Design a protein around this ligand. Structure first.
Ligand SMILES: [K+]
Ligand SMILES: [K+]
Ligand SMILES: [K+]
Ligand SMILES: [K+]
Ligand SMILES: [K+]
Ligand SMILES: [K+]
Ligand SMILES: [K+]
Ligand SMILES: [K+]
Ligand SMILES: [K+]
Ligand SMILES: [K+]
Ligand SMILES: [Mg+2]
Ligand SMILES: [Mg+2]
Ligand SMILES: [Mg+2]
Length: 1326
RNA sequence: GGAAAUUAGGUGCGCUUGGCGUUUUAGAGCUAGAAAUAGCAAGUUAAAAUAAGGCUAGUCCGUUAUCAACUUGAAAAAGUG
DNA sequence: CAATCGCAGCCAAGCGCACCTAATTTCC
DNA sequence: TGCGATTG
């Protein structure tokens, strides 16, 4: 007995099958364990393991971060209360107590129910005077009176608890006063530079236009509209856009040859502005300087809507402005509706269930839902004009705590906090002594490069401490070693050099690393002129001159530069041809030119004695992100540099790391020559060996020194790159193989054939930015979920224009258009947007075989470049559209694409093959060589997909889960037959160890040996005999006389081992919504002492697993003991306490005299068999899932495939006639579903509705009936019931919301393959 | 089948932050009526919680991965037809 | 009991490293 | 899709 294994690896399934050399699946008797009548059972060696999707760690990570921030937000308040503690005890010794118990009902409170003052008259008067906390905040900022210490605390705590963001660096000092004066100064600055065409201010209310509650682009339009003759994209318009915070492009303003984009917020602005001024001149400096001055006065116009001269709390005053205008408009809205719509007053102001004002304040109506409900009511009335204006600006009846408050920087809250401290420290000395302490509570942010402030019990932490003591926001710099922590942050993640594993890789922007990349590319450049017979390398003397002249003067070196400014102007070559570099060199000395601008000392950079210092500087600039820590690490070099360059050097920050170490490129030396790798790249006689040749040359010592420098199965797979969903199936695949090997008596298989299976928010954002750079108004002309349509998505990505013809596209005629593939689908199976365009007709592309024709590229390339700059097409999409001008698809390209259709190239699939190969092949030769006992073959899905369709082994996925197992069987058959027929293909499919046209036709007809007659692509008919053999062997590969019948017999076998992986449920305890209190006791307490009948709580806890309990419970008033057998759900929250002491946990639930040895742990999907073969799976402790599979005969599967594809060659008429000749199969398929449902589904109401729905459409076309019959299998599918539709009839799911019947059924414990079973008759228990 | 560089597009893991929401309580509802109710007034804010909790007591940890049964084992895992 | 209807925490910012695919140049 | 609530 020799055998092979077929495998189909998916995200939710692993199909498997064992075949013999006759392509047959064996059957075998397996022992059955347990206490039932059955001692053994026959099983076919074919099946599929099913499992729920494996999840990434992202959701767990976001919740872990949220917990840390709630812990730290609470500590900020605790820090503040500790500071107030001693003095607050003298004012009100129970104030903080009332704050902590504010949530408790009055019955549970220990102090008086009014938290602030402890009595009702004082509490009522507070809210009367300060209706919002911002009323109190502004008053404490602007008033000189001594304030109650309790009100001081509440205002400071409110700023510290909700402190604002940290997206702006440095200090913020808002100043509203000079918006008009600064705009006039920018106009005056602009007119002095363009006296010929000045701009008239002329009472243009710049303060109103720029500070208005509109978008930056909208206010830019309103300002430009007030200036006749000025365009929005003109020079003055871009300056206004710059002051607003946009990203204008000054390229067209100055007729530049490159983009000149500027935005003041990016740290690159100072360099970018200097780059622009270097081209246009320094007389434009005051132009952008005055633009920055105006930008500071309107920087906070979105959040600060009050003139800053009358208050030092403009944020709170802006909130007060919201409150007052809310009061004024509410009084006006109420008086209006009383007069004009008195009937709808109750619904608008009393009905919480409606989206009126009541639902806005008391119900669940959002601000957006409230505006939508009230807008038609406002338009019906008069006069609501100003209310309509405020509504469309989202400024009507506004609250103060709103979704859009995220734009408020922490410096704003800090300003008000600092002012309150300054006011009240004159009366409270402890506020003076603790002023900077309190401000530090608000401003201090744990650096992201420090991480959690742990002390040995965090697997996520890396921080180290200077001193062993508790870390506070005030001693953080002294207790935490920021330098070591910031270094460990990067050090724990960066690669080591694979060639020298003990050596870290160099920074990507290291000078020595960029020298390495330049010389490695330079050393393979050849040249030829009219005199020399054959091309020659560049000499070591030539490389140095080329580097010194071109690379050290220009950031990029073009091939034209090399030819013109070197070979001609220094070598006396009137002409020269260059090979090894195209257009321009890929490598460059970018860091060399960055430092040359900063330190201005070219001699210092070219002095190789300064090599170690420059590598240390770049290492510091790469390792650290805090520019103060950077400045501290550059102190040892403060004598070579003045203070001006040091200020520029500490701003030059780098990111990224290279692939090689400094010891590899310029450290280790060849023993004979004493030269490093970089030395050989600089000069290597006339051989000019590059990096790959040097470390592989057996005549040098680099190769042996690198060779001299050179995990469980679960950890290895987890550490692989790829989706954690496919990685779950990879581990299960290995476990299936291990079991299948032991099933075959631990004999290894001959072959293992593996095959691995192959939004709306991003689409909208990608189009809005694209048309913005495009300048088009197509989004405004014809305005998310609609972009799920493929054609409409391509329509907007192409600005409503044809990609092949340069003509407009009618958006209401998208059905008349064609979605054509850039690279034809016959070569590349790319269904993504990167390979699709929208055109009037696919004939506009040109020929069908190749890339769009030359005439199309010459006419449309300009249009494609604009779409590329607007990020509407990727660089890959632009490259393959313009490929015709580069010659188009070569004959080797077409063959390469057709080999890619057969040979799997994904790295993740190669890892699976390597894992199986290394686990199977472990013995060695007499010469210490690996003995490959098992060939691991990798196939792509198209090979079996085409095999199914050629020979009518059709697949209908909705019928059952057998298709996963059948795919694995077909993988083994096709894979082993292909390797047996053509052993030379083992180099392409087996892991380990003219001509273009031939390889194209060879790879195109590689599967023809299965057929008897072949109609070729050339049109010529070929014939093959019945039995196929191997060339040199003569062994029989395929017998078309009985091997197809073998496949038909295998695929028609009803007994297939479908196994749903039982799994303990993990994750959140329950649903997260905090529901209001209800007398129903389903609610779960949110804290230990928060009775949900008083405080509300959670619903629907998740059961981790169920347990079978055989015990007694107390019944009735007398508490009689009554023997019971029950299924108890152990929730995720309860799991730890249950497992710590099961008996104590069960006794606490009310069970007595528990049979401890009869407790069975029953995770989700636990399998039970009842009567007549009916099976049920545990959905939980209180619901069951369907446990049976409907094995529909093969003749019905093939009929359902052809009849449903009836609308979609000359032989298609034979398949169409088969459908009409077997229209009676519809009744027979319904009968199969009915008998199956009556036997195992037991949903008579839904079956009657199904049969009634089938009879109503018996005159419908056979295609439509077959399509809807496929929907009916949802009724019979394995797993959780789900709704489905037969034509227009909807059949809602019939759930099995009772688990009592399984308590006396047969529990089935299945191995991973389902071949080994332990069956427990639970009726004997109890 | 690999390596480096360049260009472009993605994925994973980890850290540090912001704003909402929701829950209970506080923000004296008034007049009439025996009451059911009716007519008005009012509404924008805050505290506290945001997995129960844990010991290791940290400004730490608490939702990923992994899991038939039986025997062994803390676990990982091994053995069993 | 069943048949039936209802419900589910979300939005945003910054940073670091490591992978992957897919084109080009030079090589093993 | 597991379960809470409502209706029949
Ligand atoms: K009380
Ligand atoms: K204008
Ligand atoms: K609301
Ligand atoms: K609400
Ligand atoms: K709120
Ligand atoms: K190039
Ligand atoms: K850095
Ligand atoms: K899990
Ligand atoms: K899960
Ligand atoms: K199992
Ligand atoms: Mg907590
Ligand atoms: Mg809130
Ligand atoms: Mg937050």
């Amino acid at each position: 007995k020799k055998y092979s294994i077929g495998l189909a690896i998916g995200t939710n399934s692993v199909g498997w099958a064992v075949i013999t050399d006759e392509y047959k699946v064996p059957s075998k008797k397996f022992k059955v364990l347990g206490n039932t009548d059955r001692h053994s059972i026959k099983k076919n060696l074919i099946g599929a393991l099913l499992f729920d999707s494996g999840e990434t760690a992202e959701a767990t990570r976001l919740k872990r971060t949220a917990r840390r921030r709630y812990t730290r937000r609470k500590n900020r308040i605790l820090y503040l209360q500790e500071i107030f503690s001693n003095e607050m005890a003298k004012v009100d010794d129970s104030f903080f107590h009332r704050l902590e118990e504010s949530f408790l009902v009055e019955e549970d409170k220990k102090h008086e129910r009014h938290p602030i003052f402890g009595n009702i008259v004082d509490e009522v008067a507070y809210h009367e005077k300060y209706p919002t906390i911002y009323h109190l905040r502004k008053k404490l900022v602007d008033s000189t009176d001594k304030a109650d210490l309790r009100l001081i605390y509440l205002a400071l705590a409110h700023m510290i608890k909700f402190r604002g963001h940290f997206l702006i660096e440095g200090d913020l000092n808002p100043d509203n006063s000079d918006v008009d004066k600064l705009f006039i100064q920018l106009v005056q600055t602009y007119n002095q530079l363009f006296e010929e065409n000045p701009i008239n201010a002329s009472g243009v209310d710049a303060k109103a236009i720029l500070s208005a509650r509109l978008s930056k682009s909208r206010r830019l339009e309103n300002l430009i509209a007030q200036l006749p003759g000025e365009k929005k994209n003109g020079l003055f318009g871009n300056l206004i856009a710059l002051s607003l915070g946009l990203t204008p492009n000054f390229k067209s303003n100055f007729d530049l040859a490159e983009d000149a984009k500027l935005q003041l917020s990016k740290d690159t602005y100072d360099d970018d502005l200097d780059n622009l001024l270097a081209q246009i001149g320094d007389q434009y400096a005051d132009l952008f300087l005055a633009a920055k001055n105006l930008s500071d006065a309107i920087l906070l116009s979105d959040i600060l809507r009050v003139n800053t001269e009358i208050t030092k709390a403009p944020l709170s005053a802006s909130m007060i402005k919201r409150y007052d205008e809310h009061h004024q408009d509410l009084t006006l809205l109420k008086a209006l509706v009383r007069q004009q719509l008195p009937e709808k007053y109750k619904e608008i102001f009393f009905d919480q269930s409606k989206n009126g004002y009541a639902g806005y304040i008391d119900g669940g109506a959002s601000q957006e839902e409230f505006y939508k409900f009230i807008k038609p009511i406002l338009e019906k009335m008069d006069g609501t004009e100003e209310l309509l204006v405020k509504l469309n600006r989202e400024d009507l009846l506004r609250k103060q705590r709103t979704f859009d408050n995220g734009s408020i920087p922490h410096q704003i809250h800090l300003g008000e906090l600092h002012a309150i401290l300054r006011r009240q420290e004159d009366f409270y000395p402890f506020l003076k002594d603790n002023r900077e302490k309190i401000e530090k509570i608000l401003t201090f942010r744990i650096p992201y490069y420090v991480g959690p402030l742990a002390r040995g019990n965090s697997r996520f932490a890396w921080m180290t401490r200077k001193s062993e003591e508790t870390i506070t926001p005030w001693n953080f710099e002294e207790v935490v070693d920021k330098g070591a922590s910031a270094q460990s942050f990067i050090e724990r993640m960066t690669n080591f050099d694979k060639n020298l594993p003990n050596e870290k890789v160099l920074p990507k922007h290291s000078l020595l690393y960029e020298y390495f990349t330049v010389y490695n590319e330079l050393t393979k450049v050849k040249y030829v002129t009219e005199g020399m017979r054959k091309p020659a390398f560049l000499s070591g003397e030539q490389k140095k001159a080329i580097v010194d002249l071109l690379f050290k003067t220009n950031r990029k070196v073009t091939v034209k530069q090399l030819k013109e400014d070197y070979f001609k102007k220094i070598e006396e070559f009137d002409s020269v041809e260059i090979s090894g570099v195209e257009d321009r060199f890929n490598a460059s000395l970018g860091t060399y030119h960055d430092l040359l601008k900063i330190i201005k000392d070219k001699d210092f950079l070219d002095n190789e004695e300064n090599e170690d210092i420059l590598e240390d500087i770049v290492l510091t600039l790469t390792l650290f992100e805090d520019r103060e820590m950077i400045e501290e690490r550059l102190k040892t070099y403060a004598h070579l540099f003045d203070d001006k360059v040091m200020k520029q050097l500490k701003r030059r920050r780098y990111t990224g790391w290279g692939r090689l170490s400094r010891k590899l490129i310029n450290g280790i030396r060849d023993k004979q020559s004493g030269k490093t790798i970089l030395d050989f790249l600089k000069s290597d006689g006339f051989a000019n060996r590059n990096f790959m040749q040097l470390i592989h040359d057996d005549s040098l010592t680099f190769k042996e020194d690198i060779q001299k420098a050179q995990d469980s199965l679960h950890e290895h797979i987890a550490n692989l790159a790829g989706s954690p969903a496919i990685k779950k199936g990879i581990l299960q695949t290995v476990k299936v193989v291990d079991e299948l090997v032991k099933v075959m008596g631990r004999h290894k298989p001959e072959n293992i054939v593996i095959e691995m299976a192959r939004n709306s928010r991003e689409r909208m954002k990608r189009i809005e930015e694209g048309i913005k750079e495009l300048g088009s108004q197509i989004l405004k002309e014809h305005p998310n979920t609609q972009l799920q349509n493929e054609k409409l998505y391509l329509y907007y990505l192409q600005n409503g224009r044809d990609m092949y013809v340069d003509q407009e596209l009618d958006i209401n005629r998208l059905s008349d258009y064609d979605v054509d593939a850039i690279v034809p689908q016959s070569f590349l199976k790319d269904d993504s947007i990167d390979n699709k365009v929208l055109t009037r007709s696919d004939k506009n592309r040109g020929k069908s075989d190749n890339v769009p024709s030359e005439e199309v590229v010459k006419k449309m390339k300009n249009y494609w470049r604009q779409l590329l700059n607007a990020k509407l097409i990727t660089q890959r999409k632009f490259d393959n559209l313009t490929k015709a001008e580069r010659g188009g698809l070569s004959e080797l390209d077409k063959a390469g694409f057709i080999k890619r259709q057969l040979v799997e190239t994904r790295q993740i699939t190669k890892h699976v093959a390597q894992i199986l190969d290394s686990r199977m092949n472990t013995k060695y030769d007499e010469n210490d060589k690996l003995i490959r006992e098992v060939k691991v073959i990798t196939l792509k899905s198209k090979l079996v997909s085409d095999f199914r369709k050629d020979f009518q082994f059709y697949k209908v996925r909705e019928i059952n889960n057998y298709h996963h197992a059948h795919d694995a069987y077909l993988n083994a058959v096709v894979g082993t037959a292909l390797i047996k027929k053509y052993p030379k293909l083992e180099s392409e499919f087996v892991y380990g160890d003219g001509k273009a046209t031939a390889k194209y036709f060879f790879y195109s007809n590689i599967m023809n040996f299965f057929k008897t007659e072949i109609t070729l692509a050339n049109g010529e008919i070929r014939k093959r005999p019945l039995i196929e053999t191997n060339g040199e062997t003569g062994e029989i590969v395929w017998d078309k006389g009985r091997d197809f019948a073998t496949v038909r017999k295998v695929l028609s076998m009803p007994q297939v081992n479908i196994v749903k992986k039982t799994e303990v449920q993990t994750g959140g305890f329950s649903k997260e919504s905090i529901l209001p209190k209800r007398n129903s006791d389903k609610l779960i307490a949110r804290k230990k002492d928060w009775d949900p009948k008083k405080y509300g709580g959670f619903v629907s806890p998740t059961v981790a697993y169920s347990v079978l309990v055989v015990a007694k419970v107390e019944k009735g008033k007398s508490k009689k003991l009554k023997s019971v057998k029950e299924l108890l759900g152990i929730t995720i929250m309860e799991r730890s306490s249950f497992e710590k002491n099961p008996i104590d946990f069960l006794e606490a639930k009310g069970y007595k005299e528990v049979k401890k040895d009869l407790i069975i742990k029953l995770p989700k999907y636990s399998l039970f068999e009842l009567e007549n073969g009916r099976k049920r799976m545990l959905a939980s402790a209180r619901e069951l899932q369907k446990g049976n599979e409907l094995a529909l005969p093969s003749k019905y599967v093939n009929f359902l495939y052809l009849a449903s594809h009836y609308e979609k060659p000359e032989d298609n008429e034979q398949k169409q006639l088969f459908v009409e000749q077997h229209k009676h199969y519809l009744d027979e398929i319904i009968e199969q579903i009915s008998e199956f449902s009556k036997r195992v589904i037991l949903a008579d109401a839904n079956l009657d509705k199904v049969l009634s729905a089938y009879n109503k459409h018996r005159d419908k076309p056979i295609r439509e009936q077959a399509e809807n019959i496929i929907h009916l299998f949802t009724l019979t599918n394995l797993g959780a019931p789900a709704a489905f539709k037969y034509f227009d009839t909807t059949i809602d799911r019939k759930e099995y919301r009772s688990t009592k019947e399984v308590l006396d059924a047969t529990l089935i414990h299945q191995s991973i393959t389902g071949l080994y079973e332990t069956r427990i008759d639970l009726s004997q228990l109890g």
